[PDB]
Amino acid sequence: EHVIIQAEFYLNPDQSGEFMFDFDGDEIFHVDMAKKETVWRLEEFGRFASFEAQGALANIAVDKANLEIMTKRSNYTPITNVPPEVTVLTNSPVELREPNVLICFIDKFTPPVVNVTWLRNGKPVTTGVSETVFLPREDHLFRKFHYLPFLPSTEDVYDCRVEHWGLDEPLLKHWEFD
Amino acid sequence: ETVCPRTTQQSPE
Amino acid sequence: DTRPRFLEQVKHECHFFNGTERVRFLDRYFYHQEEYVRFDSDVGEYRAVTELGRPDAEYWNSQKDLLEQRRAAVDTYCRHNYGVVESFTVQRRVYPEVTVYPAKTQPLQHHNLLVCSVNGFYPGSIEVRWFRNGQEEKTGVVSTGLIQNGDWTFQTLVMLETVPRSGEVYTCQVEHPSLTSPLTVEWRA
Ligand SMILES: *[C@@H]1O[C@H](CO)[C@@H](O)[C@H](O)[C@H]1NC(C)=O
Ligand SMILES: *[C@@H]1O[C@H](CO)[C@@H](O)[C@H](O)[C@H]1NC(C)=O
Numbered sequence: 001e002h003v004i005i006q007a008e009f010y011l012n013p014d015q016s017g018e019f020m021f022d023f024d025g026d027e028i029f030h031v032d033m034a035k036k037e038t039v040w041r042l043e044e045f046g047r048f049a050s051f052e053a054q055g056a057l058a059n060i061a062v063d064k065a066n067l068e069i070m071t072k073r074s075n076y077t078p079i080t081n082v083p084p085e086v087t088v089l090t091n092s093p094v095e096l097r098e099p100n101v102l103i104c105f106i107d108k109f110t111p112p113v114v115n116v117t118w119l120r121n122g123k124p125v126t127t128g129v130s131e132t133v134f135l136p137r138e139d140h141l142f143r144k145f146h147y148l149p150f151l152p153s154t155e156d157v158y159d160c161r162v163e164h165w166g167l168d169e170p171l172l173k174h175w176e177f178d
Numbered sequence: 179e180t181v182c183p184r185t186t187q188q189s190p191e
Numbered sequence: 192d193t194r195p196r197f198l199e200q201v202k203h204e205c206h207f208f209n210g211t212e213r214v215r216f217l218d219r220y221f222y223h224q225e226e227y228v229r230f231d232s233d234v235g236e237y238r239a240v241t242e243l244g245r246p247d248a249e250y251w252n253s254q255k256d257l258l259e260q261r262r263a264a265v266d267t268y269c270r271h272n273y274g275v276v277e278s279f280t281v282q283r284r285v286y287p288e289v290t291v292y293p294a295k296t297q298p299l300q301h302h303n304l305l306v307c308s309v310n311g312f313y314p315g316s317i318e319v320r321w322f323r324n325g326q327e328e329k330t331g332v333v334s335t336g337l338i339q340n341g342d343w344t345f346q347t348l349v350m351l352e353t354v355p356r357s358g359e360v361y362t363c364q365v366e367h368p369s370l371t372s373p374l375t376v377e378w379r380a
Binding site for chain 1: 192193194195196197198199200201202203204205206207208209210220221222223224226227243246269272273275276278279280281288290292308310311314315338339340341342343346
């Protein structure tokens with residue numbers, strides 16, 4: 001009926017860690033490790049619950065120690081890169097001059113390292129963009145969402161550009177009106 | 179009101 | 192950067208059946224994608240999933256205090272956190288917006304595709320049906336399937352391939368736990 005997962009990872013040599021709670025495939029919150037703050041996926045969640053961010057830091061320190069142990073035990077066998085699948089869609093049916101959101105869904109990849117760029121008419125755009133952290137999958141790969149609020153027009157074309165070590169060239173996924 | 183973490187433990191070295 | 196990477200993952204899973212009546216806890220340790228050891232509350236001890244995790248199972252199973260922590264998790268962790276989050280997760284209901292617009296299987300041909308765009312709903316389970324003049328049309332229906340928006344909403348497009356004739360009224364009907372009655376949207380040729 002329901003599944004709540006506390007998912008953690010730690011990645012070498014990047015020294016990247018992550019700590020999050022998932023409910024039925026959606027993120028309840030993650031912990032910003034550098035700020036040591038709980039980040040609720042929807043702000044209203046934070047008025048009905050809390051989480052002591054320090055506990056995540058303690059778990060990540062153990063995960064780091066275990067990664068070193070398991071790397072040795074495996075005889076330094078590295079991860080195999082799995083490149084992502086990328087889909088671009090809109091939040092809602094598109095109508096000219098009515099605000100909307102472009103969603104770039106990056107799916108089924110490891111390791112959890114990715115460079116994502118929104119392009120408007122071939123130019124990088126960063127105004128009002130947002131993103132999720134790396135989200136766990138049941139096959140233990142990752143997925144991720146990037147967001148771009150936009151005003152639909154017939155003049156602008158868009159692309160989500162995704163780079164990943166498993167890809168030979170950057171993956172560009174297009175969107176335009178119609 | 180406080181979400182509780184399950185701890186992770188260290189493997190043997 | 193071609194330096195090799197090494198990944199450690201841990202997932203502490205709480206599976207709930209009939210509210211919190213039946214609860215199963217799983218403590219899972221992974222190297223890259225390979226689960227190597229786990230604690231299953233059905234068993235009450237760590238068991239190696241692959242050869243890689245045999246040392247961890249033996250070492251952790253020798254720690255009676257650790258095992259008693261894990262054996263109590265269904266109560267102290269799973270049931271507890273369910274009570275903390277249930278009001279905005281288990282009970283979250285967001286009804287869909289339903290929009291119908293026509294489209295084309297071939298850009299040069301005439302309009303031969305009716306899209307029922309169902310947007311912004313939670314939770315994921317939904318049923319979308321097409322009707323032509325009050326009769327359900329099951330042939331020629333294709334869908335994106337269930338799409339996560341990543342922001343605690345879903346969407347889905349359900350498309351009906353059809354040649355509209357003058358007079359016809361097409362109905363897209365949506366059922367969803369947030370609704371007490373089917374939500375219907377009509378489209379006229
Ligand atoms: C690492 O190499 C040692 C020595 O050959 C071997 O006993 C062990 O099974 C290996 N571990 C792996 C490949 O996971
Ligand atoms: C992202 O770009 C940076 C340079 O800005 C590069 O060092 C890094 O390797 C890239 N990461 C991926 C996963 O492509």
